[PDB]
Amino acid sequence: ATNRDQESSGFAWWAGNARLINLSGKLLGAHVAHAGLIVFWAGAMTLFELAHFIPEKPMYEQGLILIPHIATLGWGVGPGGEVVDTFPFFVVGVVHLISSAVLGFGGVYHAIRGPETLEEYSSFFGYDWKDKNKMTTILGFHLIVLGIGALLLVAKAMFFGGLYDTWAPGGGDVRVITNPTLDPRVIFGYLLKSPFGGEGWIVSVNNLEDVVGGHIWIGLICIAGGIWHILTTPFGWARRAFIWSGEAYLSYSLGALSMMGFIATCFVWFNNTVYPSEFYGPTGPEASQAQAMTFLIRDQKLGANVGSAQGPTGLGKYLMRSPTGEIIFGGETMRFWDFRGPWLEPLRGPNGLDLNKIKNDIQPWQERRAAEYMTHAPLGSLNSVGGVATEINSVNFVSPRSWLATSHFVLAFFFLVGHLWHAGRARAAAAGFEKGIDRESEPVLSMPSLD
Amino acid sequence: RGWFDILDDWLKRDRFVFVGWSGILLFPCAYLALGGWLTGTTFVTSWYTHGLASSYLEGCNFLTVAVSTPANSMGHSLLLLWGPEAQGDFTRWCQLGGLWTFIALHGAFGLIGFMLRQFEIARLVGVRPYNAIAFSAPIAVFVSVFLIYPLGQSSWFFAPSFGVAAIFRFLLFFQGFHNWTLNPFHMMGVAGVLGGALLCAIHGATVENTLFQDGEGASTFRAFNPTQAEETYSMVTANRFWSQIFGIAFSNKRWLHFFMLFVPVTGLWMSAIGVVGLALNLRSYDFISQEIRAAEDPEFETFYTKNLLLNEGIRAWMAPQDQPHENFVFPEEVLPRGNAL
Amino acid sequence: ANLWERFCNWVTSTDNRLYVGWFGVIMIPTLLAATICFVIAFIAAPPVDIDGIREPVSGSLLYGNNIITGAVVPSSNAIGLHFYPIWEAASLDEWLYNGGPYQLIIFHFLLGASCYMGRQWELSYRLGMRPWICVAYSAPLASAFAVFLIYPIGQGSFSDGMPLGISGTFNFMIVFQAEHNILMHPFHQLGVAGVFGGALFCAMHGSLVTSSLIRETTETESANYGYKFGQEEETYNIVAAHGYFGRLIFQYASFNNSRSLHFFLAAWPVVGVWFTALGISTMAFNLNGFNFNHSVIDAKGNVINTWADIINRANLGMEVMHERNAHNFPLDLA
């Protein structure tokens, strides 16, 4: 065929996929075959989770990561997040799984039977890495596809049932979004917020109106940018600051996926809006705040005056002030006073936690929720023993948030290493010394000594 | 010539696994040490010496299996199979911890045989014996930790047991009782180990990124010939790079590789000296000036006083189960505890 | 040329005794700021309330510390993850009481170290060499990110970040073991194999090259003078070194390709430290080491203790004593 050998390509077997940089036909089959593997896992994992799913117990007690994504879109759940129909979970799994066979068929064909190069078959699908016009056009096409995808989430929230809203009155329910936030001061205000405590950058979005409004903006921006890059070519300043090669383009996207991986880690760790705690379990801050409220209710029922109860250090045993004065929970959970949750906000007034509402308005469902989230804190061992590292074997539990946070931090880190590796090599190969130093022309030998 | 030169010829024949005179000591001792550990971690318990399970047969996994030390009542007994304790009974010999001394003693002589193997091969090949000299560091560590340290204590019981989790307990024991992290001889060992790993990474990365282009392919490994006279990487470019990045750099390739020997070997020798001190409870546990001030001033607090509180919690909560022969009965009211926890 | 082009030539110049570069334009001011603040704080900073319970911990030399016990103390737990620059405090006295210097130092340091890694690529490009030295440095850099930034984020407070001191580091290691059982975590075990193995191979490669040096000097002079800086010929016999080590074990267990050997010396400790950096980073989200507490029981149901149960008794002792005044509720959830 072509290459498939060290002497014919220059790369060894352990770097054999690099023999496809100039073979556009087989490279297309690789991306399409790998795309089939992604859809396969999505379909297969969903069917696995459904077969092992028990509706009488919460999702976060069953090690589910994909079903909570479907429930958040408003399928199969009713008020309070309780599952009422498992058939939409089955449909998503089957359609993704069946679609992987189509992508698998095309990936095997384009990589084994199809032409190894597309430049001689059709001038539209053929491409060269140096062609700055064709590259931007392919980028513009995929930008449009990404734009329509973000609008699919908007159409679902506004025209096809809506989304699950953990902030809806009554303990959460599926709600249709009729007034998306279009104000740019609110949408782009998130991008300018600090990533530190009490601000949280875009991770702090706490209402569906801002979520669906942002995807309207992103949808239009991608489609507008897609049209832009199809009709234009990179300017002079852009074509002098970038390396234009296949490996260089890969390195740019590796940095991007790494960046997105770190952001997703914090999203699943802190955000309880697009990751409802009814499905994924409580967050770290949430469970720590729930413990303070649990024993607040406990001791107050026994007659304790939680407002005037001085603690051992001099700070309040139950209630204290934040650095800016807000009445917050006491103890080590003072660090988590930025937490906001539907079971806690009814107790907040203008100055923070309202002592009168604490002494009169605590409901049984709030005591219930706090006890549930306190005893489901996202702490567990590698062999899925729930609780602190000193707990005995008994509870088989590790929060899905811990699984989703740890896994994507590992992947994000290695993709950052991937960026560094492939970006450094792209510079060296483009300059012509990625294979070593020329003995007859060593640059340092032609430089003046440092001293 | 006699049978000695005949045997010498056969022992030094070039075979797939070189034997030599040192093999007469190395191979049986290394095999019995290795086979003793695998036999114990598979079938042998620690129930009568420690009150612990420690074999696959009892339900332990790879992390929890161990060949545990003999009971404290055995003192420093050699625990010979034919000795007065086991009296030739193989079963009782296992139940009393005889495999620990079996592994430690045969292992000690196996290390001697291996170092002699380094001497014997170096002489026949004709090179300098610096590899044998470097192996003195693991020997000093083994001898100090597994032999000198328990010999200074009450019995073999307080030596490290041959196991993954058991070695971890050994680490935590030295923090709560010896404050071993505070010992400057361990700190010098840490710098030698961490410094050694730094030198290893930075030297291999420097060579692999200063290579000469001696081949045409993208795989640079093929562009090398073990019989070539020229260097395979540029010392001049490597010196220029590190002189501008870090300020200083190597300029002598022979000093560089000797330094790679010196750092890890010296580090291990320093920590071996510290362990010899701990054999006699000669610890660097406290700073007297800190204790006098903290005793009179209840507002003086440092990370040093915070760590001693942790060591005190380790000792009280661990000792009853870790030293069962002492019959430590600590009532709940006497255990040191912070608020709530 | 104009003023801008002449400035660009000086920044990227290969004739400067110390290379600057564009990464150096950020690295130099941030590292100087972190260094200057660290020296002043380590010597003269007043005690700071690390745990947010009005219990200041003395860290500086002038307040009764020595080299071993001194530290720059992490910022207050009442601050959490909030950004606490100088201009956000009512006064420098408030800033000093709450651990302000800690944030200034770690933030300027982590940024200057990030540009230090990028500076390693930049000079490698200006000199025409291969660029992957910075990849090897990413392993210690990722480790510093874990203990200074990643672990505070997962726990919600810079008060649980590693202190800037010798004894403070030991306090970080002990509390980490009680709350995560890091010894029983495979990533730390892989990190131990990375640092143990790295030190082994360092002494190994050093001894084998030293053993096979070609005789070029006299017995009354150092053998290092047998190598001249810049000489073309190699200074040792790798075939003799291969012949010795190949017989110490067996033939196929020894390297004869120097490029393959030196790549192995780089891969082993770097990959091992990547794992141990990821260990701290994943344990920041409470995915802890193996828990085998009470895993072995007898026919009746009595617990049969293992060495893991003994480790747990030690962990309990660290747990109930750490921050003895900061907990009001039974579970230490963060």
């Binding site: 000594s449 | 750099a249 | 110390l18 010597i43 030399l61």
Partner: peptide, 30 residues
């Protein structure tokens, strides 16, 4: 007394860094 000793040793190390870099033995290619 102790503080002055600790700082004095540290300052000498910083001065040694200056000479070891800017006043080193210049590497010469024979």
């Amino acid at each position: 007394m102790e503080t002055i000793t600790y700082v004095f040793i540290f300052a000498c190390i910083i001065a040694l860094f200056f000479f070891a870099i800017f006043f080193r033995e210049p590497p010469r290619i024979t």
